[PDB]
């Protein structure tokens, strides 16, 4: 199966990059980190934007990846940091602002 990678709009690719890259930050396991890294690079391939936009998405991602989340069940809730991240107003505004459409 070929993935849906070529079907995404430019801002969808940037949102997809944001999510996968954030997952690459929060998870410790190498196989998982590499997987998320590899997945993010696919969205970078199809982007029309300069590398600095991804650096900036990473700047915003690190404000979530550094958070400590707690619950009444045992977990660091790493996955949730990245889900909270992709709803971030500054992230969506950054993407909407972009110079390279």
């Amino acid at each position: 199966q070929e993935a849906l990678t070529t079907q995404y709009s430019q801002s969808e690719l940037l949102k997809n990059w944001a999510l996968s890259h954030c997952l690459a930050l929060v998870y410790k396991d190498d196989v998982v980190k590499n997987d998320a890294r590899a997945t993010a690079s696919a969205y970078l391939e199809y982007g029309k934007q300069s590398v600095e936009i991804y650096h900036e998405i990473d700047e915003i991602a690190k404000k979530y990846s550094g958070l400590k989340y707690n619950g009444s069940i045992s977990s660091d809730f790493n996955t949730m940091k990245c889900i909270d991240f992709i709803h971030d107003r500054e992230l969506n505004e950054l993407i909407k602002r972009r110079v390279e459409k």
């Binding site: 070929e2 070529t6 890259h21 590899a38 993010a40 690079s41 970078l44 391939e45 590398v51 990473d58």
Partner: protein, 154 residues
């Protein structure tokens, strides 16, 4: 003109390693981006290394996304950009093959582009070809090649 084949093949070997190692070899912003995990596909970076090393450097104002190495030369990091760059600098391709197979390229050597479907990270690949094998053969199934393109290197 074009990079000599022998110099191109030699240059490619220096960076025919894991993308992490490629980052250590090249350094500068290439290395920083690979260390950060932003670049995972070394294919267009290796091709850039070849052009830079053989006297055909990627121009700074070339209309493709690129980062500098420790050498202060420029490295294109998207496969599609690398392909398009070649189309615009290399002149008329020497072989264009619809639904290609490796046997269509036997007896000729240079820069090969294959475009196809089946990959989730790219529309195709760019590498060197010596008439028998690709320079990154050791790193390379579900990819179905649609078009094969060769620029002969002398």
């Amino acid at each position: 003109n074009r990079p000599s084949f022998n110099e191109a093949w030699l240059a490619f070997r220096k960076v025919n390693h894991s993308v992490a190692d490629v980052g250590s070899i090249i350094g500068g912003n290439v290395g920083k981006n690979i260390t950060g995990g932003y670049f995972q596909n070394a294919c267009p970076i290796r091709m850039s290394y070849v052009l830079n090393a053989t006297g055909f450097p990627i121009a700074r104002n070339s209309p493709y996304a690129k980062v500098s190495g420790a050498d202060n030369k420029f490295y294109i990091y998207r496969v599609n950009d690398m392909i398009d760059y070649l189309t615009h600098t290399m002149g008329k391709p020497d072989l264009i093959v619809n639904n290609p197979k490796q046997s269509d390229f036997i007896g000729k050597k240079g820069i090969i582009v294959v475009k196809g479907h089946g990959w989730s990270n790219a529309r195709g690949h760019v590498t060197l070809w010596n008439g028998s094998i690709c320079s990154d053969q050791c790193h390379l199934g579900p990819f179905v090649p649609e078009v094969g393109t060769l620029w002969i290197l002398p």
